[PDB]
Amino acid sequence: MRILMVGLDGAGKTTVLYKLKLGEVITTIPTIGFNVETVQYKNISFTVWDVGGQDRIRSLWRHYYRNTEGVIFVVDSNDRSRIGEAREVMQRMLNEDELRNAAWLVFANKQDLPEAMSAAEITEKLGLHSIRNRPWFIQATCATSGEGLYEGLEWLSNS
Template sequence: MARRNRLMLVKMIGAGLIFVVDSNDRERVNEAREELTRMLAEDELRDAVLLVFANKQDLPNAMNAAEITDKLGLHSLRNRNWYIQATCATSGDGLYEGLDWLSNQLKNQK
């Protein structure tokens, strides 16, 4: 379980799901895709909007948001609002932009 926690972090907020991916971990991005796919198939997440944080963008070999989008298969998601935001948790870069998007999506659902 500790290994998985280093790879990704997931948080449910209302009808929104935040999925955090280590953009620097190319070896386990397929594992992240499998976990995301499994989670999105769960009944309680059927209508959840998805925010993906592509974290660790400050590292030189980090995959950018477009590459993470491809690796996670986000374009294949149908009937689900999703957004990917490049982030650096240590500096806070991108966090507020992603949370603003999620907040707006949740407001529009009401």
């Protein structure tokens, strides 16, 4: 299974990936580029493309769209200023023809932080209810603990 994981910078995309691959919480640098890794979960081998979220790189995601079976969209639940921006990025991503049938999994992340928005709140802000054309799911996660990560891999594998 081919997976594209994106989201704004600092959402926790690489932390998520290497928690999944190494069971370890690594010390990230901003990703100017991608990381690509293969992860085994329950007889599925997920090839995850973690593509950096800062602006220059954001402009490049479209090259990773093609062949994508599922999309992990990571959100920093503690950052309320950038939630609209996330909504804007994700909405036009939903309009992409190469992403047309891909399974849509939102991770509301850093759920560990006291003022993190809830997954329900995030669902309203991102406009997730309005997707009728394909599968979507939202999952509260904490990439450092590992909470919600495998519930994500589970949902994804049931595409």
